[PDB]
Amino acid sequence: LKVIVGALIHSVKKLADVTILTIFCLSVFALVGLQLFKGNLKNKCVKNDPDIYINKRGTSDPLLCGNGSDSGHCPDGYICLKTSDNPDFNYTSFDSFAWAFLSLFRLMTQDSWERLYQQTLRTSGKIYMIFFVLVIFLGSFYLVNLILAVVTMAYEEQNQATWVKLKTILFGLVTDPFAELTITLCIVVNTIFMAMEHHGMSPTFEAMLQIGNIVFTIFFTAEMVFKIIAFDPYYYFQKKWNIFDCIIVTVSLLELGVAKKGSLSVLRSFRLLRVFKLAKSWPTLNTLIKIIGNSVGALGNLTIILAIIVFVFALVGKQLLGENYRNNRKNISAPHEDWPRWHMHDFFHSFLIVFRILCGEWIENMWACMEVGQKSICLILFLTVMVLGNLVVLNLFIALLLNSFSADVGWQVRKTCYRIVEHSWFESFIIFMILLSSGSLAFEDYYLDQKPTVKALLEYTDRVFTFIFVFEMLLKWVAYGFKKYFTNAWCWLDFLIVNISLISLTAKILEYSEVAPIKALRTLRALRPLRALSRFEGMRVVVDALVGAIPSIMNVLLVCLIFWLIFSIMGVNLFAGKFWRCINYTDGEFSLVPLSIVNNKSDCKIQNSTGSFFWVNVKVNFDNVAMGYLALLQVATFKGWMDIMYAAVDSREVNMQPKWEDNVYMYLYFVIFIIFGGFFTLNLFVGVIIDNFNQQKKKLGGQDIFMTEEQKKYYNAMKKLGSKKPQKPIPRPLNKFQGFVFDIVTRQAFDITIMVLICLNMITMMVETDDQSEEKTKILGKINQFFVAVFTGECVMKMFALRQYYFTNGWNVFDFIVVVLSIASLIFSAILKSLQSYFSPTLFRVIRLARIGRILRLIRAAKGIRTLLFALMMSLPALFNIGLLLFLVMFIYSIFGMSSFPHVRWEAGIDDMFNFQTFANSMLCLFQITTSAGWDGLLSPILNTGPPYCDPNLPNSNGTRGDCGSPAVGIIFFTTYIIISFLIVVNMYIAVILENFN
Ligand SMILES: *[C@@H]1O[C@H](CO)[C@@H](O[C@@H]2O[C@H](CO)[C@@H](O[C@@H]3O[C@H](CO)[C@@H](O)[C@H](O)[C@@H]3O)[C@H](O)[C@H]2NC(C)=O)[C@H](O)[C@H]1NC(C)=O
Ligand SMILES: *[C@@H]1O[C@H](CO)[C@@H](O[C@@H]2O[C@H](CO)[C@@H](O[C@@H]3O[C@H](CO)[C@@H](O)[C@H](O)[C@@H]3O)[C@H](O)[C@H]2NC(C)=O)[C@H](O)[C@H]1NC(C)=O
Ligand SMILES: *[C@@H]1O[C@H](CO)[C@@H](O[C@@H]2O[C@H](CO)[C@@H](O[C@@H]3O[C@H](CO)[C@@H](O)[C@H](O)[C@@H]3O)[C@H](O)[C@H]2NC(C)=O)[C@H](O)[C@H]1NC(C)=O
Ligand SMILES: *[C@@H]1O[C@H](CO)[C@@H](O[C@@H]2O[C@H](CO)[C@@H](O)[C@H](O)[C@H]2NC(C)=O)[C@H](O)[C@H]1NC(C)=O
Ligand SMILES: CC(C)CCC[C@@H](C)[C@H]1CC[C@H]2[C@@H]3CC=C4C[C@@H](O)CC[C@]4(C)[C@H]3CC[C@]12C
Ligand SMILES: CC(C)CCC[C@@H](C)[C@H]1CC[C@H]2[C@@H]3CC=C4C[C@@H](O)CC[C@]4(C)[C@H]3CC[C@]12C
Ligand SMILES: CC(C)CCC[C@@H](C)[C@H]1CC[C@H]2[C@@H]3CC=C4C[C@@H](O)CC[C@]4(C)[C@H]3CC[C@]12C
Numbered sequence: 001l002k003v004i005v006g007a008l009i010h011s012v013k014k015l016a017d018v019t020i021l022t023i024f025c026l027s028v029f030a031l032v033g034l035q036l037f038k039g040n041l042k043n044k045c046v047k048n049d050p051d052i053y054i055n056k057r058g059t060s061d062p063l064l065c066g067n068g069s070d071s072g073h074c075p076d077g078y079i080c081l082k083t084s085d086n087p088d089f090n091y092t093s094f095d096s097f098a099w100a101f102l103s104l105f106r107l108m109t110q111d112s113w114e115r116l117y118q119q120t121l122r123t124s125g126k127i128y129m130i131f132f133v134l135v136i137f138l139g140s141f142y143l144v145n146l147i148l149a150v151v152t153m154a155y156e157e158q159n160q161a162t163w164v165k166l167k168t169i170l171f172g173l174v175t176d177p178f179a180e181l182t183i184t185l186c187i188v189v190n191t192i193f194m195a196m197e198h199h200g201m202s203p204t205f206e207a208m209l210q211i212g213n214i215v216f217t218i219f220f221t222a223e224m225v226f227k228i229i230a231f232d233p234y235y236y237f238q239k240k241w242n243i244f245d246c247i248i249v250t251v252s253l254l255e256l257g258v259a260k261k262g263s264l265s266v267l268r269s270f271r272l273l274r275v276f277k278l279a280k281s282w283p284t285l286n287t288l289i290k291i292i293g294n295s296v297g298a299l300g301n302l303t304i305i306l307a308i309i310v311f312v313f314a315l316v317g318k319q320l321l322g323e324n325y326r327n328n329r330k331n332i333s334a335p336h337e338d339w340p341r342w343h344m345h346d347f348f349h350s351f352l353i354v355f356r357i358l359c360g361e362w363i364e365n366m367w368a369c370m371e372v373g374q375k376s377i378c379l380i381l382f383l384t385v386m387v388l389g390n391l392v393v394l395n396l397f398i399a400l401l402l403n404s405f406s407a408d409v410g411w412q413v414r415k416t417c418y419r420i421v422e423h424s425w426f427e428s429f430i431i432f433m434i435l436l437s438s439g440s441l442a443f444e445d446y447y448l449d450q451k452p453t454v455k456a457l458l459e460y461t462d463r464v465f466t467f468i469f470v471f472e473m474l475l476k477w478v479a480y481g482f483k484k485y486f487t488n489a490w491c492w493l494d495f496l497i498v499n500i501s502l503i504s505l506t507a508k509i510l511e512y513s514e515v516a517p518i519k520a521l522r523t524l525r526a527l528r529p530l531r532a533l534s535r536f537e538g539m540r541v542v543v544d545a546l547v548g549a550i551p552s553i554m555n556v557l558l559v560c561l562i563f564w565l566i567f568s569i570m571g572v573n574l575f576a577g578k579f580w581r582c583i584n585y586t587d588g589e590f591s592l593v594p595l596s597i598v599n600n601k602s603d604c605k606i607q608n609s610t611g612s613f614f615w616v617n618v619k620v621n622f623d624n625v626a627m628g629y630l631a632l633l634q635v636a637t638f639k640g641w642m643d644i645m646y647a648a649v650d651s652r653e654v655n656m657q658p659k660w661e662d663n664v665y666m667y668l669y670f671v672i673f674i675i676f677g678g679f680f681t682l683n684l685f686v687g688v689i690i691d692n693f694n695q696q697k698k699k700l701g702g703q704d705i706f707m708t709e710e711q712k713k714y715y716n717a718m719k720k721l722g723s724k725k726p727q728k729p730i731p732r733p734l735n736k737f738q739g740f741v742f743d744i745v746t747r748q749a750f751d752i753t754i755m756v757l758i759c760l761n762m763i764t765m766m767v768e769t770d771d772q773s774e775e776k777t778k779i780l781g782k783i784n785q786f787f788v789a790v791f792t793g794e795c796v797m798k799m800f801a802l803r804q805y806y807f808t809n810g811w812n813v814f815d816f817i818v819v820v821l822s823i824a825s826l827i828f829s830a831i832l833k834s835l836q837s838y839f840s841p842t843l844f845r846v847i848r849l850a851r852i853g854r855i856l857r858l859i860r861a862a863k864g865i866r867t868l869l870f871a872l873m874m875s876l877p878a879l880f881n882i883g884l885l886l887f888l889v890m891f892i893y894s895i896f897g898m899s900s901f902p903h904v905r906w907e908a909g910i911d912d913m914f915n916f917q918t919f920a921n922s923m924l925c926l927f928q929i930t931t932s933a934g935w936d937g938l939l940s941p942i943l944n945t946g947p948p949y950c951d952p953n954l955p956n957s958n959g960t961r962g963d964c965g966s967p968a969v970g971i972i973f974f975t976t977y978i979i980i981s982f983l984i985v986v987n988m989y990i991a992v993i994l995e996n997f998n
Contacts, residue, residue, distance in 0.1 A: 011154060017864035018150045022143050024865065026108065028855060029135050030100040031765055036131065036845055037124040038100070039770035041086055041093040043067070045078040054078060057588045058908045060335060061087065064122050068842070072122035072913060087119055089367045094120075095770040107132070108140045109386075111363050114934040121924070122913055125842075129924060136931070141985070145992045146868060151391075152398055152993070172230030183223065184281070187274055190216045194272070194569055198624040199577030199654075217252050217271075224249045248274050262573070269570040275562065284559040288684055291404045295396075295680070298403060302396045309392060310354050313385045318350035320381070324373040332368040336591040337660065340368060341646065352667060357382065358389040359638050359674065397683060405687035417479035430472060431535045437465055438529035441895050446902035446917035466501045473498055490534040497531055500524055526895035529888060537708040538881035539888065545696070545705045546987065552692040553685075553983070560681045567673050568628030574669060578651040579621040581658050583614050585948040590614075592658060601655040618647040619943040630971055635670055636678055637978060640936025645670055686986070693990055706878040706991055715877060722870050730805040741801040754794070755861055761787045761854050784851070788822045791854065795819040811860050818853025825850035868996075875995035879988060886984045890926050893977045898922040900973070901942055903957035904965050905950055909937025930985075932978045942970040 012019075043065030045054045053062035054075060064087055065080035066072035074080045086093040094100045107113045117132050193212045201209075224245065228236055236242055248271060255267040262268040279285035295303060322345040333340045342365060344350045353365050362382050369378040420426065440461060443454055473494060477485065485491045500521065507518045533539045582604045583590040593613060598604055604613045620640060622628045634640035648666045650658035697703055707715060732742050744750065764783050767776075795816060799806045806812055825847055832839055832847070859866060901916045916922050929935040942965025944950050952962035960966060 014154045014157075015147075015150055017868065018143075018146045020862075021146065021865050021868055022108075024858075025139060025143065026101060026104050027762075027766075028852065029131075029139060030097060030104045031762075031855070032849065032852060033104060033131065034094050034097060034100040034768070035765075035848055035851075037120060037128065038094045038096075039082065040123045041119055042082050042084060042095070043080055043123050044083045044085060044087075045074045046081045046083060048077055048079055051083070053083075056911070057906065064119055066123050066125065068125045068840075070126040071124060088115070089371055091367055091370060092116065092119075097766045097769070104135065104139070106363055107135050108143060109360070110136075110140055110931055110933065111360055112933075113931075114928055114937075117928065118911075118914060126913065126920065126924070129927070133927065141988070142872065142992070145989055146996070148394070148398075148989075149993050149996045151395060155395070155398060155402070169230055172226060184278070186216065186219060187277065191272065191275060191565075191569075194269070195565065195625050197569070197572055197576070214256070217256060220249055221253060245274070265574050266570065269573045272566050272569060275566060278562075282559070284555055284684075285562075287404070288559055288563070288680070291400055291680055291683060291687075294400055294404055299396060299399055302392075302399060306392045306396060309389065310351065310358065313381070313389070314351035314354040315347060317344050317353060317381055317385075318347050320377060321369055321373045322346070322350070325369075328372040331371050339660070340372075342368070342642075344369070348664065348667075352671075354385060354389070355671060355674075357385050358393060359641075360390070361638070362386050393679075397679065401683055401687050401690075404683075405691055414479065417475055421475060421479045427535075431532075433465070433468060434532045434535055438532055438891065440465075441526070441528060442919040445898060445919055463505070466498070466505055469498050470502065493534070494531060497527060500527070523896070523899055526892055526899060529891050529895070532888065533885075536884065538706070538711070538877075539885050541708060542706050542881050542885045542987070546983070548696045549689065549692045552688050556685045556688045560677070560685070563681055564629065564632050564677055565625070567677055568622075568625050568632055571622040571631070571669065571673075572625060572628050574622070574666070575648055575651055576621075576623050577654050578656075579618040579623075579647045580615060580655070581618070581647075581650075583616060583948070585612055585614050590948070595657055595659060599657050603657070614948045616948070618644065619940055620644060621647065630975075632673065632677065633975060634936055635673060637932045637935065638674075639932060639934065640939070641670070643936075689986060690990070704878065704994075706881045706987070711877040711881075715874065718874060722874070728808070730802065730808065733803075738801050738803075741797065745798055745801065751861070755858070757787065757790065758854055758857055761851075762858075765851060765855070785826070787854070788826055792819050792823055815857060818850075818857055821850040821853050871996050871998075875992055878991040878995070882984065882988045882991060886930075886981065886988075889977075889980055889984065890923070890930065893973070894919065894922040894926045896973060897925070900959075900969060901965050903959045903963050904941045905944065905963050907937075907941040907944075907949075909934060909939070910941045914938075926977075929974070929977065930981045932982070935974050935978060939970055939974050941965065943967050 041064065045063045045065050046052070047054075055061060056063050062085070063074075064072060065074055067080055086095065092099070092103060094103060103116055106116060113132075113136075117129075120132075121128060190212070193209060197209065227242075237246075251267065252271050255262070255270070276285065276289065279289055322343075325340065325343045325345045329339050329343070332343075342349070342353060342356070344353055356362070356365060362385070366378055366382045369382070440458065443458055448454060476491070504518075504521050504525065507513055507521070512518060533543055580601070582593050582598050582601070584593050593604075593607075598607050598613065601615055604615045607613060617623075620627060620631050620634055621644070622631055631644050634644065645667060647658070648670070649661055649663050651666075652659055652662050697705065704712070704715065732739060761784075764780060764787070768780055772780075799816065806816075828847055829844065832844065859869065897916045898919060904910060904915070906912065906915065910916075910925075914921060914925050914928070916925060925938060929938060944964045945967065946952060946964075950962055950964035952960070952964065954963045957963045
């Protein structure tokens with residue numbers, strides 16, 4: 001095993017710098033989080049009065065508490081207390097360094113980070129979103145990008161190192177061009193017919209579908225027999241393609257043979273594999289087949305390695321924890337059911353747990369396993385599975401990705417107005433007006449009801465602004481030519497936006513101001529901030545670069561809209577209309593009635609004694625092709641995946657009560673879809689995007705896209721500054737009292753002493769915990785005083801020794817700033833210790849954050865971490881441009897949601913602090929879903945359309961006459977936002993990895 005030992009040594013060598021950066025940044029952010037909000041999640045709403053905790057609606061967990069003005073409030077009759085009960089199995093808080101580090105690792109991996117984000121904001125405050133933004137961008141996105149680049153550069157180095165019958169036969173080879181076109185049209189229309197198989201289809205519709213299927217089968221069988229007759233058995237069987245045609249046709253007729261229709265219910269849709277026959281005319285489908293083929297044939301070794309890894313981990317987890325799961329099932333199981341839904345007793349569920357980990361959800365299944373088993377076994381297994389599992393999956397993803405895709409006065413006035421508009425004064429005025437109007441849309445919130453002055457101010461501002469933007473566009477018309485206006489792309493965006501605004505104002509001032517199309521137009525006022533794309537050079541360049549790839553994006557989008565249609569049809573065939581359930585809606589929470597009391601739809605009417613039995617359907621299901629697509633997307637983004645996976649498994653037959661794990665093997669459908677419409681349908685898009693970017697960068701000759709000329713000269717100047725080989729030494733003065741200090745400093749031990757001192761300061765700051773003993777607190781305070789005093793002493797010593805030559809070094813200034821910041825924080829804490837009127841602990845905590853400079857001082861002593869930070873600050877301009885675009889998109893969708901969903905029932909996804917009522921809350925929700933985290937939860941409240949989930953007769957809430965939303969707009973909104981923010985973040989990753997590649 002010496003060869004593999006050396007290989008892993010080299011691999012860790014390539015991973016050494018990235019691993020150290022990850023560990024160091026994680027530790028720094030863990031200390032920051034600990035100090036900023038330690039012992040804060042313990043808060044719980046407690047009865048005012050052997051204590052009682054209120055529970056969040058739809059959940060059994062206690063309702064967490066905040067005390068500040070911006071943190072989570074508490075209902076009437078309850079006062080918030082610091083009860084010594086950490087939330088969520090008491091395994092998630094910042095009460096100590098270990099827990100803070102685990103929470104920060106979870107935030108980095110984004111494994112349900114939505115829950116931690118919500119809890120921390122609810123307890124600490126709404127102004128601490130900055131910490132989460134910083135850890136997501138600097139921590140999560142950035143560190144993930146460096147790990148990806150490291151693997152990509154590890155693989156590249158590995159590659160571098162490496163009679164009548166005869167008459168019929170004569171007539172049987174017509175093979176006219178019309179034949180193939182007719183066959184293609186036939187299959188297309190067959191798929192179209194099979195794509196309208198819904199739940200409540202009339203018997204006439206069912207008969208029509210049966211007739212269509214049988215006649216199409218007859219046509220395909222006739223073509224098969226006619227072709228095979230045209231040749232002999234020795235021929236027409238030498239090709240895997242016609243072999244596959246034979247398999248599909250024989251399966252089609254064999255299924256027809258049986259009178260039980262679909263025995264497995266997949267045979268009915270097995271006839272959809274022939275849709276791959278469009279591959280011949282579609283190179284995109286051809287390359288999709290090629291990537292799958294390379295997955296099975298080219299990288300088969302890697303694929304089987306991944307398979308054996310998953311199988312082994314699942315089997316080990318089963319054999320180790322199944323007995324404990326069975327014995328203690330009552331601890332983690334839901335209140336009503338007896339067994340845990342996601343457990344590890346049997347091999348199937350253990351493999352499902354391992355697959356969920358590889359999908360990126362392990363904290364909940366680690367919590368449950370810790371509760372129902374030894375904590376030492378759990379942590380080792382889950383962490384090992386996650387790190388090793390996710391590493392193998394990404395290694396395979398990049399291996400397939402590279403292996404495949406890499407192998408009269410009129411003229412006078414015209415000129416005068418041209419000169420006028422060309423003026424930078426007018427340009428800046430227009431930019432200012434656009435940026436003012438963009439931000440002026442944040443005040444049209446739900447809470448605007450109580451403030452009438454803001455309404456009048458906004459109305460007058462918009463009325464003047466639209467006229468200012470009609471004048472601006474009329475000055476453009478009279479200045480520039482009509483041809484060049486209506487040929488430029490941006491001039492339209494402005495013309496259509498102003499047209500929308502003008503017709504909206506016209507409808508408002510005339511009648512018909514409350515009609516549905518006019519309201520929809522008003523909803524389109526959220527596009528107003530979009531006018532700023534043209535006036536900013538960075539955003540204009542970024543959007544030009546994006547639009548340069550729209551053709552390829554659409555080409556891949558079609559080939560994944562078909563490959564998902566296959567699965568949508570197959571799912572609608574497997575279970576359509578079988579998701580309905582009979583629930584017990586007591587006050588605000590429910591459980592499906594036990595099979596004993598109720599067994600089917602009719603029983604819900606016979607047993608309707610209490611009037612609390614409702615027969616309702618899962619919000620997202622496979623009733624028709626549209627909802628099949630929606631569920632497919634929910635499973636693809638790995639959000640809302642569990643709920644449907646429960647409804648599908650608990651389903652027997654139309655109009656029958658769901659039963660616990662009646663279909664325990666229906667998880668395989670979702671597993672197979674995840675694999676195929678995930679891994680591969682994303683690999684294809686990522687390959688196409690990286691080829692399009694390469695060809696758009698090489699053809700135009702301009703690299704480092706997403707950057708303007710000023711940013712380019714800055715980027716040129718920063719590169720020169722970073723690589724400055726020559727340096728001017730500092731002469732040694734003759735005076736002995738300074739020569740002796742210079743001799744001491746020059747010795748290669750001052751740096752070592754400072755390094756060990758800062759390391760010990762880090763350890764001392766780490767040792768602190770929550771509710772520590774007073775002796776520990778006092779010794780820590782004295783040690784902090786000692787450390788700050790010695791650092792200030794040495795800094796002033798060397799500053800005086802170097803005279804004015806101290807500031808020549810770039811980072812000596814940073815050292816001086818951190819030292820003086822420590823001194824100021826100490827003297828600002830000492831003065832606060834007195835009366836000083838009134839103060840709050842959070843102020844002390846934030847003031848004590850200045851100690852992190854003494855930790856950041858270790859950067860200058862790093863090996864490659866300084867280089868990585870240099871690359872980050874070198875990419876900073878491009879990332880700034882793309883972030884500006886992303887924030888513009890976020891503003892657009894925040895206004896859309898803030899105008900569309902202010903009246904919705906607060907379900908498990910939307911609560912008091914994460915609604916769309918106000919601009920701040922809208923921004924929190926939009927930032928949360930920018931990672932596609934919790935978007936299913938935010939979508940669920942608006943998928944509801946009737947009782948018991950709503951009260952369409954609820955007073956006010958006239959958006960839909962009630963307090964529930966419209967799926968038609970909700971699905972569009974959320975799907976479009978997630979796709980757009982996925983493309984934009986992919987652009988960010990491309991920028992970062994191309995910069996690091998340099
Ligand atoms: C959130 O804010 C509330 C309101 O300020 C805090 O309530 C207060 O909590 C303190 C500490 O538990 C209570 O102090 C004790 O009061 C009793 C008398 O009732 C006294 O004998 C003890 O020596 C001690 O001073 C205080 O009474 C209580 N106030 C009320 C009105 O209940 C709450 O602690 C805060 N929660 C957090 C985690 O900050
Ligand atoms: C919903 O599911 C339940 C349970 O499967 C169905 O209950 C069954 O209903 C029939 C008709 O009322 C009952 O039949 C009668 O049972 C008595 C007692 O055995 C017998 O003396 C009569 O001759 C007759 O067979 C049947 O017993 C009952 N099931 C059980 C287990 O008692 C119900 O009909 C279903 N509803 C629908 C409309 O699907
Ligand atoms: C068991 O009995 C209760 C009580 O009669 C039934 O409640 C009723 O359920 C229907 C369907 O969910 C509700 O219909 C809706 O009412 C709202 C107005 O409240 C209306 O806007 C909707 O268009 C729709 O008609 C109905 O209101 C509700 N009645 C009450 C008093 O809550 C329940 O459906 C029964 N369960 C079964 C399985 O039959
Ligand atoms: C279904 O819901 C009803 C209504 O909640 C339950 O009936 C009673 O509801 C009250 C609360 O309104 C509880 O205090 C009682 O304990 C419930 N029990 C009964 C039978 O009166 C009903 O029990 C629920 N059924 C099931 C099987 O959960
Ligand atoms: C870094 C030096 C000082 C310590 C060396 C030991 C290593 C293993 C470190 C890493 C994680 C550390 C632990 C992290 C958090 C806690 C919980 C706290 O309530 C007491 C200290 C304690 C238990 C720490 C002790 C030291 C520790 C175990
Ligand atoms: C029908 C139920 C049991 C689900 C099983 C999966 C079905 C639908 C599909 C998925 C992938 C398919 C295979 C994909 C590729 C090929 C190669 C081709 O040359 C002959 C058909 C064959 C061998 C297919 C057989 C049927 C298949 C296994
Ligand atoms: C609200 C409605 C009425 C607005 C409609 C605006 C439409 C007509 C605009 C928006 C973007 C425009 C395109 C943007 C850029 C170009 C390239 C150039 O060759 C001129 C035509 C063409 C292709 C434009 C055609 C018209 C266009 C599609």
